[PDB]
Amino acid sequence: AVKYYTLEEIQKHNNSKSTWLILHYKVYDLTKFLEEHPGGEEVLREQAGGDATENFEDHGHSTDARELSKTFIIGELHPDDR
């Protein structure tokens, strides 16, 4: 089964309590990863609540980084918002 979230729901997760973002139509909860992120937390907080695909790809992440990201996926962007 797959859980779908709308852009409306996602934008609400951009506070000290929760940090969600979208990458290639998948929704990632990075709340607990902010402080472990090699690239820093500021770069992640600035994209919170929205689609950060271009920025993610812009910094060209390694295979290990991409494999690790999967553990934070909690769902996908609703087809109607794509």
Distance from C-alpha of 14 to C-alpha of 65, rounded to nearest angstrom: 22
User: Rule CB under 6 A: is residue 72 a binding residue for ligand HEM?
Assistant: yes
DSSP characters over 50-62: SB-HHHHHHTT--
Single residue of 10, 19, 27, 28 touching ligand HEM by CB under 6 A: 28
Q: How far is the CB of 10 from ligand HEM (least distance, A)?
A: 14
Piece in contact with ligand HEM (CB under 6 A), picked from 3-11, 12-20, 54-62, 74-82: 54-62
Residues ≥6 apart with Cβ < 8 Å to 75 = 2, 3, 4, 5, 26, 27
17 vs 31: CA distance, rounded Å? 7
5 part of the interface to ligand HEM, by CB under 6 A: no
Instruction: Give residues in contact with ligand HEM (CB under 6 A).
Output: 21, 28, 30, 37-39, 43-44, 47, 52, 55-56, 59, 61-62, 64-65, 68-69, 72
